[PDB]
Amino acid sequence: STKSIKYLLFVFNFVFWLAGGVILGVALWLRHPNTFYVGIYILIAVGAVMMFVGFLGCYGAIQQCLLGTFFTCLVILFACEVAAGIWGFVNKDQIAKDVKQFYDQALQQAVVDDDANNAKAVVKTFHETLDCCGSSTLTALTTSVLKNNLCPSGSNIISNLFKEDCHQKIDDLFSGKLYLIGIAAIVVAVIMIFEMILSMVLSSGIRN
Ligand SMILES: CC(C)CCC[C@@H](C)[C@H]1CC[C@H]2[C@@H]3CC=C4C[C@@H](O)CC[C@]4(C)[C@H]3CC[C@]12C
């Protein structure tokens, strides 16, 4: 094949193959009162989908069924994104309250149970991503005074009583910051159609 743009897809999907394997491997590490595990299995499914889809896309450099299956994977994923996009939009508070309950159970097990490497890693990343600590402003104090290894960066104890907690940012992420999720969703939508067109171009180009 003459076109090197077909050769680009191998590197692009191989990134998501390793990312799929890492996300799958990290999700299994977090697996190591079920709502916290309910959110963990979503990461297991996401990590497994990105692995086998990233497998077909990456291994598409070998050049077929393999490539044709990869194109069908992008079509079904695009239709499920539309379904998850419209439904997730109309139920924006349903998943928001579920992210709350996920964060609440993760924070409880991280503070009370000191041997919970999974609960700490989840809440710590939630803290570094949202600049929060504790569920309520009272939980911000209990976490900062006791389990300060969870609060993000060098945030002191006094700085958490005035800052907004995660139960404020989780809602603000879904309410005011829904434009951010819309961007990320469309970004996934435009890279799917871009890989879809480039997949049938590769199939029409590999014919020699
Ligand atoms: C389970 C729901 C509610 C959470 C959202 C899951 C999303 C973020 C996950 C699940 C499946 C994932 C996709 C799986 C396959 C591909 C094709 C690949 O070439 C680019 C990455 C891409 C497009 C992944 C993007 C992220 C993805 C869409």
Side-chain angles (χ1 to χ4, degrees), residues 1-30 32-205 207:
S1 300
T2 55
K3 298 266 82 181
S4 297
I5 184 174
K6 313 158 177 166
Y7 200 71
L8 192 158
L9 292 179
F10 161 79
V11 184
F12 192 86
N13 283 98
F14 180 78
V15 169
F16 284 102
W17 183 74
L18 289 184
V22 167
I23 291 306
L24 175 61
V26 168
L28 296 178
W29 163 265
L30 307 183
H32 194 7
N34 294 124
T35 305
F36 172 73
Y37 282 160
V38 159
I40 289 188
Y41 303 150
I42 298 180
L43 234 60
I44 301 183
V46 169
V49 170
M50 293 192 306
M51 185 178 185
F52 130 89
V53 172
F55 163 80
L56 299 170
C58 96
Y59 203 74
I62 312 293
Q63 304 159 47
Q64 282 307 292
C65 213
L66 193 100
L67 195 79
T69 51
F70 171 54
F71 184 83
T72 310
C73 293
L74 295 171
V75 176
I76 60 185
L77 262 49
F78 193 91
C80 293
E81 179 189 343
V82 172
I86 294 184
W87 186 97
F89 175 80
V90 310
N91 284 280
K92 73 198 79 173
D93 288 17
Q94 187 73 287
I95 60 186
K97 268 66 177 298
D98 296 334
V99 171
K100 294 179 181 304
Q101 189 176 190
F102 174 83
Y103 169 81
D104 290 14
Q105 300 182 8
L107 178 62
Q108 177 188 10
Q109 191 181 189
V111 177
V112 180
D113 208 38
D114 191 20
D115 50 321
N117 306 275
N118 49 13
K120 292 178 179 176
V122 169
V123 178
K124 197 174 185 180
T125 52
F126 269 179
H127 286 355
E128 304 290 344
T129 47
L130 296 187
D131 186 26
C132 99
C133 208
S135 300
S136 173
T137 50
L138 175 61
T139 315
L141 298 177
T142 64
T143 311
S144 301
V145 172
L146 299 171
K147 216 68 163 298
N148 217 331
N149 301 120
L150 272 54
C151 290
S153 304
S155 57
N156 59 90
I157 304 174
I158 309 298
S159 181
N160 293 16
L161 185 60
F162 304 95
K163 282 180 178 179
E164 56 279 351
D165 46 48
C166 264
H167 280 199
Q168 296 184 49
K169 258 130 171 177
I170 291 181
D171 282 326
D172 185 70
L173 184 272
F174 277 101
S175 303
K177 297 300 186 303
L178 199 59
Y179 174 71
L180 303 183
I181 305 180
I183 285 187
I186 297 302
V187 164
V188 179
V190 298
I191 64 178
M192 282 182 180
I193 61 182
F194 198 67
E195 285 180 336
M196 283 198 299
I197 297 182
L198 288 184
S199 297
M200 280 307 181
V201 164
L202 174 55
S203 69
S204 61
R207 178 174 299 273

